[PDB]
Symmetry: C4
Subunit: 192 residues, 4 copies
Amino acid sequence: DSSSRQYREKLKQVEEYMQYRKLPSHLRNKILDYYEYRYRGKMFDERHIFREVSESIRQDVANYNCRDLVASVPFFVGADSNFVTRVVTLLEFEVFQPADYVIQEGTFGDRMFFIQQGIVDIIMSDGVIATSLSDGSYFGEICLLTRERRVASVKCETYCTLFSLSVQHFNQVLDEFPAMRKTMEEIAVRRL
Amino acid sequence: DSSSRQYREKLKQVEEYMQYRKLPSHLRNKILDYYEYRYRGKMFDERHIFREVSESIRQDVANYNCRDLVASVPFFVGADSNFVTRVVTLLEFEVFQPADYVIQEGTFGDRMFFIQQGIVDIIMSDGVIATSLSDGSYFGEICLLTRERRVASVKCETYCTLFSLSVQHFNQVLDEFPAMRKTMEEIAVRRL
Amino acid sequence: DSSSRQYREKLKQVEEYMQYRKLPSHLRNKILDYYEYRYRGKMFDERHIFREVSESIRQDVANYNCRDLVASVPFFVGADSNFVTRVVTLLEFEVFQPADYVIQEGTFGDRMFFIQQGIVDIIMSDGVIATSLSDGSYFGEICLLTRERRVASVKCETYCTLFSLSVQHFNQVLDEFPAMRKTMEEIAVRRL
Amino acid sequence: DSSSRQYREKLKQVEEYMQYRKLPSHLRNKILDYYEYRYRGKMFDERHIFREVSESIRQDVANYNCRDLVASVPFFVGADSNFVTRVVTLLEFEVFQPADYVIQEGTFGDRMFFIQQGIVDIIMSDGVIATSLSDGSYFGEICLLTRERRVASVKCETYCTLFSLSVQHFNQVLDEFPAMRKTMEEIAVRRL
Ligand SMILES: Nc1ncnc2c1ncn2[C@@H]1O[C@@H]2COP(=O)(O)O[C@H]2[C@H]1O
Ligand SMILES: Nc1ncnc2c1ncn2[C@@H]1O[C@@H]2COP(=O)(O)O[C@H]2[C@H]1O
Ligand SMILES: Nc1ncnc2c1ncn2[C@@H]1O[C@@H]2COP(=O)(O)O[C@H]2[C@H]1O
Ligand SMILES: Nc1ncnc2c1ncn2[C@@H]1O[C@@H]2COP(=O)(O)O[C@H]2[C@H]1O
């Protein structure tokens, strides 16, 4: 009930803002669809709760909420439990919509992404689709490894729920667990 | 209605503060005129909404709100779409009033400015007005390029609505898109 | 009464979040037990109050709240009053529960801990318990001194109330008071 | 009225916190006296208002609120208007009480202080009072210039209203206006 009020609250002011900005209907609808899809009529916080509790509770909760993702990512198979715990506590939940470009070829990158659910296309600079990726895969790591630029664009086919890891956190966890930098570099190369 | 309440709320406490500080009437009136001009009786947030949505929605909204500015700035003509998107997502809205000095000659600079609407005078250290700038122009870039000091003062003739880019973001976008540093340096020099 | 309302407020939304996340009952109960143990039905802030007052009031309040801890830590015996004041103003209160791992062997460390109340086991990488520590002791300092990795795990036997000092603050206070780095290094070595 | 409600609000929760912490009566009274002295039954914000307005309004308001201080500080006599404006916009208001040590000899310093109103004693490491300072004077600059340690303690005789400048801002304004570093160094030395 408190989570429901939070959402109705939010949605009212969103529609007011979109009115003052005279946003086109297509864009107003994109935004309303996003709130509905992501929040489904309820807005808790989690950030507040996480901060009120111990580091142990935060790890336990992050591990549970990310259980399905961890099981779906072959990358995490046989990984050190401390590695998995560190990553899941640093992941940020993100949602994207059909046809959204999560990544543009040739730009700088600030984070990488793990796919919880959804399908994305990997699009080369010439416009050819190299491949599509889905649940349990990840992308946007190459740029973080080379500190150069994005080598392909990534476009959502469906609604996508992703968990991102920032370049700062990425570099942190790979230093703490060097074995995982090695395994990561190997897939980067094998994205030919 | 919620945006209207936010504004009446705000204005009440502003007048109370100005009373405790015994601000002169001329200054109280300047402040009230500013709130009226900028907010026009309604205070949404945008910062909250932007943070609740995807990076794609943020780009779409920033691109739409900055559409007229982008069209008016010759600098953006033929620019890479990714460049324009990066800039507009980093711009900060600012409003200044007639006779305000946005920039003082001889000081350090922390940001540059794009003029959405308004007229400013460029005033040399001797007091001569070199020129006036208006909608679609920009200023305050020289200091960011040289990392030295402001070479002129800039004084508002009218109410001005500006979008600023901080030195940190300025240096970020120019590194990401070096071609635009080149075009920027060329106008800097051609401000003779 | 205001502190009580704050807590009932909080607990209501916590149970709602745990419902949306379908947390297992064991974990829901761990979280509820934590809030009850730590806050005991009342949530003040302290952070807000500390920020509304002078540095002197902040030192006086931190010194009083940490009086028992300071008396129990032999480390503080004969220490410079300015050293003790600096530390207590930088400590962060943390609570952990029975069987929680505060520290895992082999990871990077971001802070050290002083035990106000509770018992922890020091567990070597082979699983042998080297020793147990309790009220007035401290742990997690070795990693901060070597800038290497945690050399043992630390597991709570009881509920534990700890005060942590971050690596940044740790390095600050030791620079300001070098004599205490010396005394600290000596115990680090004498954790054989 | 809104400022009055804010204060009664605040004071209620302060007394509740002091109760949970079982603070001694002398300290509870020190805190209540501080709130009464500083806020006088009304809590506006200023930080919120400053952030809602232009840089020009912020400079105008800071200049007005600091007018008496600026007039009382001989240091500002003949100074560049841009220097004075920069400083006043970076000052932080602080209040201290009789017998408070604002500065302890031998510690590291994070800021310096301008005295709006009040009297402080400068106390050497041997306990001799070198001198007393009052309205329009400043102290705590030596440590910022040498990047060493505080050379004396500073103890309030009366209630003191001060404006502090952090080491980061201090170093900023002195770089922007080198002439003022020179004048500052000269008084530092002439504090024999
Ligand atoms: N052939 C490929 N197969 C799978 N993923 C790819 C391929 N080429 C590029 N990518 C991904 O697309 C991402 C785009 O941005 P990055 O260059 O950071 O890293 C990229 C890789 O994660
Ligand atoms: N002759 C000129 N014509 C147009 N703009 C100018 C001229 N001289 C200076 N400026 C602008 O005035 C701004 C003042 O601060 P900056 O030195 O950062 O950069 C400056 C340029 O943007
Ligand atoms: N033999 C020991 N006796 C007491 N404390 C210990 C012993 N071995 C390790 N520790 C503590 O266990 C902590 C684990 O993390 P750190 O390596 O940072 O530092 C460690 C010391 O504080
Ligand atoms: N003889 C003095 N006369 C006036 N002020 C002094 C004297 N000696 C020290 N101070 C001030 O006392 C302050 C204590 O800390 P700082 O060393 O940063 O800088 C100091 C000077 O501002």
